[PDB]
Amino acid sequence: AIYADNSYSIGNTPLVRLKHFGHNGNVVVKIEGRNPSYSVKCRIGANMVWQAEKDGTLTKGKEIVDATSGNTGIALAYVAAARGYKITLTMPETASLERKRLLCGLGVNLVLTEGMKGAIAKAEEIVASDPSRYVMLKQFENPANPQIHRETTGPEIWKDTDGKVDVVVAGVGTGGSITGISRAIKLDFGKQITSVAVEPVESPVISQTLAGEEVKPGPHKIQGIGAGFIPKNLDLSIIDRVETVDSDTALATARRLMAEEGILAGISSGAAVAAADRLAKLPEFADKLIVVILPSASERYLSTALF
Amino acid sequence: AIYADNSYSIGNTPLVRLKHFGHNGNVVVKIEGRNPSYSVKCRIGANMVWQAEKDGTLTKGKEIVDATSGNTGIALAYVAAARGYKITLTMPETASLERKRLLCGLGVNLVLTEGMKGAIAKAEEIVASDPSRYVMLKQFENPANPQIHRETTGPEIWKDTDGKVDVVVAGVGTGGSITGISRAIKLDFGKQITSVAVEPVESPVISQTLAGEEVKPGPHKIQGIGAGFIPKNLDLSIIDRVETVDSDTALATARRLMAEEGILAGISSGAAVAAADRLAKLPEFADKLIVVILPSASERYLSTALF
């Protein structure tokens, strides 16, 4: 059919079988790069706006305000444009001039902070400046983030695998993908799959937490994941397994996806695939169907270490 | 289902209704940016390889060679990777270091020429160097280019509009999109639509030809269209109308698509939409459904005049 605006066009992303990873085609990847603003966040940018509309906190005239590390801001920005909201996003000077020119092209009003914690508080300052005019959508805790994955991404995986999916592998940024997907397949369709969270070995706060160890975040290059804390939108209770990956291997795996599979993957896509490949070569998973989320696409990383 | 490699995942791109163009939603856009390598050429990169395989000119071991202005090379490159062919593409130094790093990331063996005619002949030199090893696919004349549009892009438009499409607007680069689409809708489904070719006012060789005027190509900024000659893959006989657009307006229209529709459009996408908007505001088309091809996505243009 014909979508009334670009937000309604989210999802229905394809599954592709890998040939040079896993064992006898048991690893399949979900291309979230094929979305309105070209990442997995287009789904939650749409649903967080829709749900704020459904409950009246977002109205004609009110202005979206928020802080992002990038993909969510781009996603909110295209939805704000498609649906006629003004939007302000808080960015320090930390960020790719890439993104500054992209967000400005999408009509965003931007700022300065000089890292993530600093821009967040600045956004909070603005919402305080006029709480009747400004709405903050808060991706890390808004339930509409995992909800859209339970309603679209999860069911798409179920149908495209004819219920044969056994393992879902996804890096954790806000936690909404692994959480919403796991709830759809385990609770709505009733299949006891293995849900595998992926985080950087440099910042393994989820593994450290579950082990009852000292939580010690650190720096890494795997953009989009490893926020350095446990987000509210990560439902620990549905997580069966945590796999850690290092930045170097994440980047090499993404370069392999391009050059060997013809898949224009982002950095965190190589991270998720490297974890899935490790599981796929354990005999306990060799006969099981593993589905891996590839959150973003290669061209958003042209100024990064990926090239 | 699950695609055996990334080439099989082409197409099934969405239709979105425009709100700030046309008259009462009569203009709808087809997002070809949502493809394996993120342009409309992913379809012909796949089908030119498949068809060369079906007729034996492409075999295990033979190496793809060709010259491109970019999107087709990226498309062939991902298909070569997914399907295990070596590929050499001929590029002068004319081109975005963007694309050089992208094509190298995809595993391409590249060259130097120092414009388009020069790199073409260099590619021809290489195929002559070993005609048993090198295969040139020749997008401007290979019938598998319009054929894939007749088999996928055209039928997708038919079904997603429930046969209500009245006008198809598409810029002409090789001509395969407008040609294959027009043949599907007019001949296979039997509806007498208006097929509208779009070319730059700076290089209006199609209009000049059809008028019996002196053909005078020139420079412009509308990347992907206006090759400066009539390509063999443009079937003049199904073209009902030619609309010309200038570079400045093309760029402004693409910036409007981002900031006002939330659509991350390429430069030639703004060209096609500006032509469709002109038709859409003539009373003879005000009640007719117009479908516009948006060939590429915004991020491939970050180093260009688009920003």
Numbering used by the authors:
A (entry chain A), B (entry chain A): 2 to 115, 119 to 311
Sentences from the paper on this structure:
Similarly, M92 interacts with main-chain carboxylic group of T69 with the distance of 3.5 Å and M96 interacts with main-chain carboxylic group of S70 at a distance of 3.7 Å. In the case of M96 mutation, the interaction between M92 and the carboxylic group of T69 is broken, and the loop moves in the opposite prebinding conformation, more close toward the active site channel. This move increases the chances of inhibitor contacts with the binding loop, therefore leading to increased binding affinities of inhibitor for M96 and M92 mutants. HiM96A, StM96A, and MtM96A mutants exhibit almost similar or slightly more cysteine synthesis activity than that of WT protein, suggesting that the M96 plays very limited role in directly controlling the catalytic property of CS. As expected, on-rates of both HiM96A and StM96A are three- and fivefold higher than that of their respective wild-type CS. In HiCS, mutation of M96 increases the affinity by approximately fivefold (3.4 μM versus 0.65 μM), but the affinity increases by 24- to 34-fold in the double and triple mutant backgrounds (HiM96 AM120A and HiM92 AM96 AM120A). Similar to wild-type CS, M96A mutants also show high percentage of quenching in the range of 73 to 94%.
